[PDB]
Write a protein that binds this ligand. Sequence first.
Ligand SMILES: [Ca+2]
Ligand SMILES: [Ca+2]
Ligand SMILES: [Ca+2]
Ligand SMILES: [Ca+2]
Lengths: 486, 486, 486, 486
Amino acid sequence: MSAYQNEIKAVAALKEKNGSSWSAINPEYAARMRIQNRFKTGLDIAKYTAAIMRKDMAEYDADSSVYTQSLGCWHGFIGQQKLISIKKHLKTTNKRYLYLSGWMVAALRSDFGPLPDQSMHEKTAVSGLIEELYTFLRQADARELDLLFTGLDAARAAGDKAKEAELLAQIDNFETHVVPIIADIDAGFGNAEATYLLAKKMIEAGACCIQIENQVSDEKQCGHQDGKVTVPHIDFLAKINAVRYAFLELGVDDGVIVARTDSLGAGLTKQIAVTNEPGDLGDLYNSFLDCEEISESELGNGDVVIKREGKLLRPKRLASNLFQFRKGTGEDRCVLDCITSLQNGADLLWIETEKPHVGQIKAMVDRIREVIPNAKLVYNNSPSFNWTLNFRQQVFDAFVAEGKDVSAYDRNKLMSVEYDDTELAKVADEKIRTFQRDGSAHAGIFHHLITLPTYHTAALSTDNLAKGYFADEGMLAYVKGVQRQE
Amino acid sequence: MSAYQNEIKAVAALKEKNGSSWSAINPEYAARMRIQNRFKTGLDIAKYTAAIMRKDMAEYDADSSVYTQSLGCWHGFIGQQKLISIKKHLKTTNKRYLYLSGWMVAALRSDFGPLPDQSMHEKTAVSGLIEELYTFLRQADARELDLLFTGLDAARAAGDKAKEAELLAQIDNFETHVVPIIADIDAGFGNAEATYLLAKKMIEAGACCIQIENQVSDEKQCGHQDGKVTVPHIDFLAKINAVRYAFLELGVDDGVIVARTDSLGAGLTKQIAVTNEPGDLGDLYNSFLDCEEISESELGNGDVVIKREGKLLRPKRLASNLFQFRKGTGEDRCVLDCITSLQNGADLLWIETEKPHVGQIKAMVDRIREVIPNAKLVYNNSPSFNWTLNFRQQVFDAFVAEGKDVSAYDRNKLMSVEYDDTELAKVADEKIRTFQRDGSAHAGIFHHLITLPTYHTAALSTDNLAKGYFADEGMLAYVKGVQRQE
Amino acid sequence: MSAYQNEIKAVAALKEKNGSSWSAINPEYAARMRIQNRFKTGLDIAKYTAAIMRKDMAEYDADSSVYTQSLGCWHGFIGQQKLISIKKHLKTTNKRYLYLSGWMVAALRSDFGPLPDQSMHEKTAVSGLIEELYTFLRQADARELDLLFTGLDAARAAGDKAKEAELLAQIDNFETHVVPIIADIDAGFGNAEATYLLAKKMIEAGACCIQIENQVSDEKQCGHQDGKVTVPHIDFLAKINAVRYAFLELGVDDGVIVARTDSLGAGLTKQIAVTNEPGDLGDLYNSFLDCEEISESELGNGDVVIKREGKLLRPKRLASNLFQFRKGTGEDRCVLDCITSLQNGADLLWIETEKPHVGQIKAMVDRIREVIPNAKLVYNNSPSFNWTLNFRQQVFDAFVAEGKDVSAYDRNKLMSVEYDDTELAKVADEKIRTFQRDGSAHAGIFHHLITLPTYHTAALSTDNLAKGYFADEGMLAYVKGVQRQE
Amino acid sequence: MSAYQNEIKAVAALKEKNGSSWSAINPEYAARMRIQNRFKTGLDIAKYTAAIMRKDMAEYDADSSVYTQSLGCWHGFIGQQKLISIKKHLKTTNKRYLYLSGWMVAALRSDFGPLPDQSMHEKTAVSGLIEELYTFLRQADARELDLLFTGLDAARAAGDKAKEAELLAQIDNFETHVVPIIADIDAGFGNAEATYLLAKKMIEAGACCIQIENQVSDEKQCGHQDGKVTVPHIDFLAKINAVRYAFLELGVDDGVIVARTDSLGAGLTKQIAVTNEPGDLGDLYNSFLDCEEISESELGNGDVVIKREGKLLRPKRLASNLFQFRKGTGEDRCVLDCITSLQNGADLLWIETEKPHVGQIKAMVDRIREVIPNAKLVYNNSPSFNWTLNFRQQVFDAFVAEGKDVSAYDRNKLMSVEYDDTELAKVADEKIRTFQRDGSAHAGIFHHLITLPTYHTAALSTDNLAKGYFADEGMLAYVKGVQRQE
Ligand SMILES: [Ca+2]
Ligand SMILES: [Ca+2]
Ligand SMILES: [Ca+2]
Ligand SMILES: [Ca+2]
């Protein structure tokens, strides 16, 4: 028997048990409400979506062409219209997820108004947006099912048996708009206990996947090129553990943790790591510090020094009480971070990079996979990269191997108003088009997202309408720009 | 002295008064924060914007070409990007307002998820959105002023006196993003006391203008063409009075009330109005009831009858306990509604119509203005009208006067895939382009809005990106669709 | 195996399945978190508590001495301390519920500040308080279980096997603080669809029982003694049905609906009920109208008249457009209301009375039970009754039967500073003490509550401390008044 | 002219200006609404209350008997009933403030449910409670004024001119329930920018006084007796500056900053302070570190050492990466903290102590006042001190000076069931009663508060009712315990 039939039977039995006092209750109508509300709680969503993500991860492991994608959405309505569009044009939700952007929560969803991306807003805005996204996806299910039940009644009123049968099949095979979300928790908005508390609220809202990072965003030195600040592994691993316990408490056994490393762009640290024996994680972290040998006499009062390899050394230290890593150690620290995360409870990796470059990320993933062979990445196709410059430049240098042409193209004015229609341009655009496929084939990327794309699409579409409506076009700007497209 | 200078002086004096304990306080830095926060409370916004709207109403009275416009915005970020676009392209905020759409609050901003437009959501979502819109507009001011103060410091560091002087002038003449809002309160979300309470919260959030309606939206009969339900004038006038007292309590002497009538599409009423003498408002309302003379013997048990003009008559009554107005009385009731509103405390009118038709609205406004000569309308350029059909049809019939052509155009397939490039089409589009101007010149329209335009622009722009990104275009859909435009 | 053991086994198996990457996860620690979070969602609470209430209703049906009690609580902390006190002193939660007072939500929990009890506040404050109450009860469970697991670890560290065994038994037999709540939804905060929407949110928050009323609180005439306003049964029954569908959609098959009638104190109605044949519910409702025969000539213009029993009659009508019921029909209308509710989907009754009087309520319940023999009441032991006056007066008149004494007691100054120690006083206090038992034995009362008792206890306890602390007692007022008691 | 008269005149003039369309507006009624809403925004409250606190601080400086008091309140209703009680019994609000307890926000007001006092909850709960407290105080004003205007109308209806005149005087001299609040911001819930953002929201809600602390509450080692963790002065001073800029931006020139030091119970620090020359604040902070001289050969790999007074020393360091201060340096660090705070922008001090002991606090204040002679304290009369033990013990040892008795009293069983009626007990209670007066006379205490007293009073009063109501007393527990007192 179908889910719909089973629910009609179930409500009819309650009606019978309760007798004539329930005479006004219509069992088929109640059944439709039940079918229209498949996911009654956020934890039901979290368990359902966790299983989907685990299946997708296994299918990617078997075939690197079968990867997953998402766009960051800053409101339930934006997520809803994205999933409606996916179903309309692409016919299945399979391999499409939501992304919860901490940047967009800070920029758009705080009671404080727009804030920078430093975990300064009220942390309930994060869990609030997850719940909102799933409320809107569940309502999209309910509306489409209601339309199907309306057509079912119309088929019945016309005695059309074939159409009734096709609609009942569409109802039984209905594809929910509810999909997995990768939810950004920043660094947990506090210590490990605070991380657990927030993760728990995010999972109760429906999240099957939590992304957590090893940086201290509120200590960035904007005046330094690599001004981000990392914590020792023990601090970050404790937060991974806190997120795991939130999943476990709630019964989401399959919950997914994405460990993000910011080490590539982080030249600083607040702490010197505790170390108990040489070669352990504390010692490895401290090994990257930029030190100098200063005689005990040449040392300033209050200077801080560390014993490394039998000598007392002075790590370079800013006025802000931050210590510096040696230049050029970003990649090495990322690889250590990532291996350590997968060895200690993370499920997926995120390496924050400064440009979209398949070879660069492949190099790091190859080093990681010589230790953890199926290590999988979530990759931010960042909206703050200038994709055209990066890729025309990338295709320029790919020429220089046997690129005859080279001299015909400057390399400094490549991004231009008009280098269009050139081979470098059509090829650059093709490399952009295949970037995700190529990174998933060669650099272990399981999931491709853009963090804040719908910030820009909402701004642009508002500007494009306002620009006409308030000026000579008046209502024609709306009719042409909006009404004619839909 | 400029506002900026005055604030530097003011903070320097406090620093001096407090002595060396305030040595770390930088008076110019504090002054910039004060300049960046011109509107410290919502009531400061409400008073500032009320004066703007009153000025605009006076300028429209003197010159019908000088009208005002707004688009409905469903989030602070959408309102913010609209005002940023206005300033970028059109160089002034003058004559541009915000509109708070009750439909979009119901559809998008409730803790219940999407709801129909029946005042069923939590009413604090309405005031919450007003505050959010003004938080985002105030932040846009702060960000642009911060950029100007940054350029001021750079001019000073370069010893560039002319540029320093130009920037100080740009700071002193800065045009705020804060503009008036026309805020939809539906029918007040309750009785007159409840209306006052909500209005007060909306005005405290910054609203200088409240739009209130005479319908009972939660009693619509969707099964009737003119299924809306009105209340007797005494009920509606009490709510106008409640809104006035909220403005007065808060000191917003100049607050604006828009009285919306739904009578054109309302064929029903729940109440029979109390009347004390013939010809008063109660009697006029009841005069429009659709009655029939039934002998006391021919009357059903429990039937309800009214004495009109010396006879007992039975008003037509639905099973839902609603009474029917005579067909064709919509316009007459609208004119009575509107005259009554302006005679009893409203400032502006809104006549809800079923199509964008200048002659139709002019006819009603002419009747109103023979009593109230400067009566002014707020006109919803409704997004649910098919603008192309309506206006090609309107231009078809404008031909038929001496429109030779007529026979060359069907009138039933006018809206078409390809009647484009015809004279009827180019002319229809021109009529759309000039619709607002023409209605403001001929039909007393002070303000033109669209209620839910940014619902559609957000949906469309999300669909247009998703359609490519998740299919073969991948990142090229974002680079082309988004990054290349901005 | 115990729940605790089963959860340790379950987490150990996941740890084994996942391998050394989960080495830091402690299965017993995770198991404790699971035991400490028995009720992971509000719907789990609603189903658990609904079964308790159904069991209690059956046990009351078998034995009228086994009734249930609650106190209204206005904050999660108040509910929590009530349940902690119950467990400490009375050793079981059995037969004790929570009550959610709509009056206290209006007075205390609105974003508007204190409001009168007219459903004018934001309706999400109602569901919000249910969730808060259950959050605090769940946290009380977690804290007490954490203390038991701490003692378990201490027993183990001391090698005390008997104590370890007793603590494991206390953990396996732990009695949750989570109990049923009777949740006031007023009249649904809107129409039937709105009622469904709010009920659904209240049930998702944990409520197994919803109390809904047939009055229109925002139309009370405070200037009339019996100034409340009722709706026809069809309107109220539609709202009962809406609440049932919310329970059914959510899978809370056992959900309980309390139908409250306000007819005893309601002399008015806004509507004249639709009636299709004599004797139906519409006709019965209209039968109670106070009408007068006026000749068609003697009738005012616009007067409204109804055909009852072959004649045209004019129901008495206020300027407010409300119709009057005949005096002395309150009880008859209550009995009709109640029978109708139980015949059409309600589970329990609430008859709002003007004084605590067992005989008065028994009279109505006897009439109801001659139709519905097991009809059960929820009875508000109202805090706005003067219990001492009512009951000394009640005991005075119980004397007058063969009460010799009568002359020794005035009857007008009975409530007095000093009629204490009299037989009338000690007996009046005893009648108060046994009031609930007696009403449950003789008047069908399944549940006794007080609506807003913790409003008064919080006010009193704050006043009693402030009165001393800020005056000569200083810190001694706190030490004596607070610290010495606990 | 009175405020009331002036407002009647003001509204009558608007009515006249607007003409007959405002005929329904009653100017006296509107005037009453204005009088009933004296404080239209939180910033109006903050400026009004800041001036009160500054006046009180000056009056305390002139006379140490004129000090101020508050009780922590966890809900607007609790604060409201406290101020109502003050006005009823003590006839003026003068010298009584509110206290906003961060502990009670964590324990009671978070969306997460009860949390420990570690700034882990959503920070908007803090500002939310300030706004709620002032909403309830403003409503208490409105209700009492409404009662006075009702009596005014009754006097007029009786032609009683003397009573009309007395009521108008009571209206013109009405004492608002709105008083200053000392608002706990913990350590700012983040860095200095985050502190500013939250302070701004708290001041906009009405707070004229912000209390900020130098500890890192989320790093406490509960396993250490003095397990709190401090930050170097530069970090704390930056947060003082952030709070000052919030006051200044908002125009609250008179805003008060309370700098709380936790150094007395803090034996740890996460950071070693940056120092530029000997004797500066960084060097002074580091001077308190507990170091040991270890030969470069005897040092572990990765050990951290500091140069102090020409030698390399190893500060004691926990596995948690925290450094230890020398035992017995708590008082010295408190005195440095406090002097530094008043020298760098704080207005008042708070020294967190472990027992209520006038001599102990006087000792520290004397050291502070030899540098800052009018330094003033806010003193927490902590509810977690056992006041009876501490003070019977204090009075026991005050005997031992020439206390003959000594031998008659043990000193270990002093707190007892029955040492009552002894001279030590009556004297201990008298010392408790005069503790605040004595500390204000001898130890510079301007303000005495209890942090979480209404947590306990609400728990106790709920338990005391539940204990009877649910057991044999039934309704008599409410009538006796509640109804008879009020
Ligand atoms: Ca992030
Ligand atoms: Ca509306
Ligand atoms: Ca109620
Ligand atoms: Ca604190």
